[PDB]
Design a protein around this nucleic acid. Structure first.
Ligand code: MG
Ligand code: MG
Ligand code: MG
Ligand code: MG
Ligand code: MG
Ligand code: MG
Ligand code: MG
Ligand code: MG
Ligand code: MG
Ligand code: MG
Ligand code: MG
Ligand code: MG
Ligand code: MG
Ligand code: MG
Ligand code: MG
Ligand code: MG
Ligand code: MG
Ligand code: MG
Ligand code: MG
Ligand code: MG
Ligand code: MG
Ligand code: MG
Ligand code: MG
Ligand code: MG
Ligand code: MG
Ligand code: MG
Ligand code: MG
Ligand code: MG
Ligand code: MG
Ligand code: MG
Ligand code: MG
Lengths: 127, 33, 46, 97, 88, 122, 41, 176, 201
RNA sequence: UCUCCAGGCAUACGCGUAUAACAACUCGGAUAACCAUUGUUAGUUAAUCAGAAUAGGCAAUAAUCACACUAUAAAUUACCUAUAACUUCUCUGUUAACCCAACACCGGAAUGCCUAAAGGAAAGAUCCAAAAAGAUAAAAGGAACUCGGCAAACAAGAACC
RNA sequence: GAGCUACCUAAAAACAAUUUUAUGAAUCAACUCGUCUAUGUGGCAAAAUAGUGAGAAGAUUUUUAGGUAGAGGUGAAAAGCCU
RNA sequence: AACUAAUCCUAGCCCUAGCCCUACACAAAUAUAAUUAUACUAUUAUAUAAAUCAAAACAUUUAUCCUACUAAAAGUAUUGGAGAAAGAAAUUCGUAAGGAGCUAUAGAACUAGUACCGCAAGGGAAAGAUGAAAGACUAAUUAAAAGUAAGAACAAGCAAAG
């Protein structure tokens, strides 16, 4: 969970449990070409790769073998009408390699596939 | 010194046609009569 | 020699010379921040 | 020069509103009221110049006397500097000695 | 798999002047990070053997290849004799 | 010529400059630079069994909404604690000392979930 | 700007009408037209 | 599985998708704490699917079908979050009487302002921490002038603000 | 934004974001402020046009822009325009309604159709109701279709929509336990370790 | 494909999306093509590259292939004694033709490897006037030029105040 | 305000080939410097270009971080340098 | 027979009057190279304001600056290179929302302490204009500035005057 306090842990302390999770993730189509097992996610910047593994395995029951993450810099070059820089939010991209030989390919959503001889005179006139 | 280059923005259609835009259709709140 | 390139950027030097922690170190530097807050500056320090 | 190309909206002055109609009443409150009140007590304005008149240097000093200690820092700085500007002009500069 | 630019080296375990220019056997110890228990925990149980195979192919290809270039064989003069080595 | 307005992040500066993006720590760095992850420090997602659950994301437009009555301590106290104390007072088995009997906790220390200072996340 | 001169247009026209038959910028530019008109007078 | 990140296969490509009303707070209050815990994850899976569909629409440069569905989901999660917050708040008040879950205090900073300070968790007491003792919760006398300048600056803004409202009503009364 | 001018097009629509771009600084429109209590015109109320092109013609309200004190009547105060104009085709001629200010219209008595001024007053139950200034009478609040197009009576829930009774079922049992404790007990999680001392400061 | 030129590839520092695709053809490139421009969408993936327990006791003998060899400017946590803990992988950097010089500035810019296998194009079309700038050749003479052998030279040697 | 420059502190770097010797020695690159002439003079450049030159194992050059501040600092004294 | 242009009215502002204030606003982050969830290295204004300037130089001195109720006593007593200048008291008196202000080069610098300039302290802009309705296709009004175009010039000269 994000924007919440985690109890400080000291030797012998309990397990840290989050009953309701503030993390929301979205599955995105890869920009470059990825192995069939690999899956891309966009995740909140405060999520760790450990969080994604347990998040997917428990909420969605997806067996995960590896997770890789990167932080993408958002562009700050576009300027508004007052010449003030506009910021695209920075985000974190997670690469999930499925386990058990399982394969996934992004689905294809949105499968949907007068008279030339009397010019300039209104035709309504019957005279 | 100098003055800044404000881009200084029947015209919206050209603006969005050159730039390209996603114009989602809108449900008319009042039905046309 | 050609002048005009007296600025040799370095983030370590910049944050040490004009940074938040540096400005608060002495009372005169704290008053630098107080002036800028009163003026309304968007950037109090580097 | 350039001039307006259309006439400005007509200006209407109502001459018999309450303020205009009853203007000047109770100005002889003294002679017609046994002198309990002076007419200068009926003036509404800044505290330092009710029933008083002076040149700019005199007005600056009198404002300082009345509200000087309740003024803002920036205003008191400007007021004090205006006094010194006017003092040096009226006492050192001019055609007549 | 990540790219870097640094010295290119072909080595068999000794320099070309060394008379012992051939290979008999290599013994490899897998790091604890790749051992059986950790892989099973990570749910990559099918990779337990894969770790062994990858190390041999890379380890032996480099060692058998490096021996060949100690004998003068390269991509434009391909080996006339198969070069053999084994590893555990 | 440095940019004073953009946010200071770990992407900027020399290699030595590093700082976090807001992710919570999950372990400790020992001497000689060994990272030791602590299992308890890693959050656990407690997910319930949703089999046979009748509630779905959206609701009937035909379902009447209710008048808002935000919960107050008085309303909570009356619903839960008033029935016992009132019945006990009639029975006469009541005293100030035994408020724990009705659910009062003199102190939060020793509880896994403490209401103040809060020691659990949402 | 409590008080601003509002007749400058007609003041300019007075000098200009006496200069319209000159050649050059003397016939249209007040600063040059004014001097040329006086010499004519 | 990963199938849950996408809508029903039939719905793909459809111009619109029918959705019901979002949960209101009062309806949620009827449900038990255990039910809300399950209902949260039901909403979360729907939210992830809608966030997923929103991005794919942008990638394809197409309008997102029935974008109101996302708004309804976000509202319900706020209501579920709110109702649970109320229940904890009342229970905290009854057993402790505290108005905030987190400790804090009113403190004056080195610039002479009064700011609420939110406490942090440490393993050692405050008098032994050397990183805490560098932080100053007091202002030296050279701040006194700047304190007055703020009050006078604020007084000017409010006086201007009152004056303008009076002028605006004059325009209304003349117009009407 | 202080300069956003309210128009007939709904706020946030493509037309609105072109009629009111961020850089627009048009002159404010002067609106006689009207209290939420004072305002008495509602969608579906029949009203009469006091003056104008269609003065004396009664109509039905279909839209209200309260920021402009506007009431829009169906089929009245209509000028003509082309909709769907394209390069190849002219479009279709239609009559477009224009806004009418509140003071240019009056509400209509139901039984006797006349422009009766009304006054707000409570009832026996206590609900606020409009009453005619003359011929004192209850003008009922009319029913207007929902803006989003959702008719509850016709609505039939599809998948992912909770059924009525299930939404209205009561399962809450008041107790002095947080949501955290309830779930752990219900799910049977056991934790006997306790957090060490933390010095909040 | 041809003709010709000869500091290129990495890292550090710095910069901060200029990266890539598409669509645009207003603004930006000192012009066009095309885009470095505008809008939209994407991107940089690391346990090895790179970044971020306590208390005592004690040290004579450089480096340079370290041997010989001398020298002078005299020159780099370890090992022990006790205590304590008793299986760990999270976080962050990773794009580009890039930076400092108001500019797509003939300037400035550290290190490793290598010297053409890498990287590049001096001419928009035409015309061959003066004056101006640069390169090459010189009949006979050889400082007569000039403030002065300045500049240039098939010279670059010798001496003296 | 010492990210330029003057000087300093700490931690680091670079110097091929050739001859002498055993070196603030020699020839000459990289590198540092800027002698003389021409071009340029709102220029490529608010001090450059092209040639020609001086040093090039040292009082050498270069990199990174720190220090000294205007009644002052620094100075192999040019009243030089301190954006 | 028109291009470049021009016209415009309200965004706000100004001075008073009145008035102590109790605006200090979700979660989270931040004094670490601020805005980086936990130990390491702990934390702290200032001794007298000076000078310009006046004294036609300058060297003691030079109103306000460096505030203690109004009107009078009074520019009086006094103080002073007895020069320039400075200047009391005793005592008496005292019960109370507006504009012959600005209207886009004006009024606040302000559409903004932003863009931009500067290593930093710091400096610091410019501008808008349809209508009841744009779910009426975003209007009109003007021989009107300089500048041009329509329409290069035709012995001889402060360019005009008779
Ligand atoms: Mg990484
Ligand atoms: Mg500069
Ligand atoms: Mg430098
Ligand atoms: Mg590109
Ligand atoms: Mg293109
Ligand atoms: Mg582009
Ligand atoms: Mg490393
Ligand atoms: Mg790269
Ligand atoms: Mg140029
Ligand atoms: Mg090549
Ligand atoms: Mg070329
Ligand atoms: Mg040519
Ligand atoms: Mg020659
Ligand atoms: Mg010859
Ligand atoms: Mg001669
Ligand atoms: Mg001679
Ligand atoms: Mg010569
Ligand atoms: Mg330095
Ligand atoms: Mg050498
Ligand atoms: Mg030498
Ligand atoms: Mg030499
Ligand atoms: Mg020499
Ligand atoms: Mg020196
Ligand atoms: Mg000398
Ligand atoms: Mg200087
Ligand atoms: Mg004097
Ligand atoms: Mg003096
Ligand atoms: Mg202004
Ligand atoms: Mg201004
Ligand atoms: Mg003209
Ligand atoms: Mg003549």
């Amino acid at each position: 969970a994000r924007n919440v306090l985690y109890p400080l842990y000291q030797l012998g302390g309990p397990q840290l449990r989050v009953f309701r999770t503030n993390f929301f993730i979205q599955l995105v189509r890869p920009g470059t070409a990825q192995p069939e097992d690999t899956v891309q996610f966009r995740i909140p910047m405060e999520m760790t790769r450990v969080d994604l593994r347990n998040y997917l395995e428990q909420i969605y029951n997806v067996p995960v073998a590896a997770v890789r993450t990167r932080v993408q810099h958002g562009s700050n070059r576009r300027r508004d009408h007052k010449n003030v820089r506009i910021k695209k939010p920075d985000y974190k991209v997670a690469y999930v390699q499925l386990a058990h030989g399982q394969t996934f390919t992004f689905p294809d959503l949105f499968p949907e596939k007068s008279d030339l001889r009397c010019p300039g005179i209104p035709s309504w006139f019957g005279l | 010194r100098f003055r800044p280059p404000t881009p200084e923005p029947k015209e919206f259609l050209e603006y969005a046609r050159k730039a390209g835009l996603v114009i989602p259709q809108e449900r008319l709140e009042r039905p046309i009569h | 020699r050609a002048r005009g390139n007296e600025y040799q950027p370095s983030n370590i030097k910049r944050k040490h010379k004009h940074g938040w922690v540096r400005r608060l170190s002495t009372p005169a530097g704290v008053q630098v921040i107080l002036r800028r807050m009163l003026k309304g500056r968007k950037s109090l320090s580097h | 020069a350039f001039v307006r190309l259309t006439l400005p909206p007509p200006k209407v002055v109502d001459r018999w509103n309450e303020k205009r109609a009853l203007f000047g009443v109770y100005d002889n409150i003294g002679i017609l009221g046994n002198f309990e009140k002076h007419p200068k007590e009926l003036i509404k304005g800044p505290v330092w110049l009710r029933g008083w008149r002076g040149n700019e240097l005199q007005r600056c000093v009198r404002k300082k006397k009345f509200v000087g200690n309740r003024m803002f820092i920036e205003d008191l700085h400007n007021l004090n500097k205006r006094i010194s500007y006017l003092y040096k002009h009226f006492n050192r500069h001019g055609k007549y000695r | 798999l990540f790219r870097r630019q640094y010295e290119n080296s072909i080595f068999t375990g000794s320099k070309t002047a060394d008379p012992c220019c051939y290979g008999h056997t290599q013994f490899h110890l897998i790091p604890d990070r790749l051992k059986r228990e950790r892989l099973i925990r990570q749910n990559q149980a099918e990779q337990v053997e894969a770790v062994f195979r990858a190390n041999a192919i890379a380890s032996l290809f480099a060692w058998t290849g490096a021996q060949a270039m100690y004998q003068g064989f390269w991509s434009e003069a391909d080996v006339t004799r198969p070069f053999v080595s084994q590893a555990v | 010529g440095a940019d004073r307005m953009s946010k200071w992040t770990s992407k900027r500066g020399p290699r030595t400059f590093t700082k976090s993006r807001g992710a919570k720590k999950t372990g400790i760095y020992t001497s000689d630079r060994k990272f030791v992850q602590i299992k308890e420090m890693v959050p656990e997602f407690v997910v319930p069994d949703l089999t046979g659950f009748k509630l779905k994301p959206y609701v009937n437009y035909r379902a009447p909404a209710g008048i808002d009555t935000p919960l107050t301590a008085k309303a909570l106290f009356q619903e839960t604690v008033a029935p016992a104390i009132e019945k006990d007072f009639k029975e006469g088995t009541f005293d100030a000392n035994n408020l724990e009997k009705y659910g009062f906790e003199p102190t939060q220390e020793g509880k896994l979930f403490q209401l103040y200072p809060k020691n659990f996340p949402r | 700007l409590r008080n601003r001169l509002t007749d400058r247009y007609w003041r300019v026209q007075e000098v200009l009408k006496h200069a319209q038959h000159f050649r050059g910028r003397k016939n249209r530019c007040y600063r040059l037209a004014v001097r040329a008109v006086t010499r004519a007078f | 599985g990963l199938e849950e990140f996408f809508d029903d296969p039939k719905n793909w490509g459809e111009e619109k998708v029918k959705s019901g009303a979002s949960w209101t707070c009062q309806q949620l209050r009827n449900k038990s704490n255990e039910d809300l815990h399950k209902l949260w994850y039901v909403l979360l899976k729907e939210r992830n699917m809608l966030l997923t569909l929103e991005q794919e629409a942008k990638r394809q440069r197409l309008p997102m079908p029935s974008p109101e569905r996302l708004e309804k989901v976000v509202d319900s999660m706020d209501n579920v979050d709110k109702v649970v917050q109320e229940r904890e708040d009342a229970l905290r008040l009854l057993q402790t009487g505290q108005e905030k879950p987190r400790p804090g205090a009113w403190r004056r900073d080195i610039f002479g302002r009064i700011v609420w300070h939110k406490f942090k968790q440490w393993p050692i007491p405050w008098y032994l921490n050397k990183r805490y003792n560098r932080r100053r919760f007091f202002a030296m006398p050279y701040v006194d002038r700047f304190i007055r300048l703020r009050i006078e600056k604020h007084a000017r803004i409010e006086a201007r603000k009152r004056s303008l409202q009076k002028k605006k009503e004059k325009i209304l009364h003349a117009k009407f | 934004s202080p300069f956003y001018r309210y128009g007939m097009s709904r706020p946030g629509s493509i037309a609105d974001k072109r009629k009111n771009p961020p850089w627009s600084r048009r002159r404010p429109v002067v609106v006689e402020p009207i209290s939420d209590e004072d305002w008495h015109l509602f969608c579906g109320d029949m009203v009469e046009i006091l003056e104008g092109k269609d003065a004396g013609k009664q109509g039905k309200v279909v839209q209200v822009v309260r920021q402009r004190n506007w009431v829009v009547l169906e089929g009245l105060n209509t000028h003509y325009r082309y909709i769907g104009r394209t390069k190849d085709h002219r479009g279709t001629m239609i009559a477009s309604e224009a806004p009418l200010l509140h003071h240019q219209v009056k509400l209509v008595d139901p039984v006797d159709r006349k422009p009766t001024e009304i006054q707000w007053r409570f009832t026996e139950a206590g609900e606020r109701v409009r009453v005619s200034t003359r011929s004192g009478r209850i003008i009922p609040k009319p029913e207007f279709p929902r803006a989003d197009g959702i008719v509850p009576e016709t609505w039939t829930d599809g998948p992912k929509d909770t059924s009525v009774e299930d939404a209205l079922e009561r399962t809450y049992v008041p107790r002095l336990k947080t949501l955290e404790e309830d779930v752990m007990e219900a799910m049977g999680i056991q934790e006997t370790r306790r957090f060490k001392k933390v010095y909040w400061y």
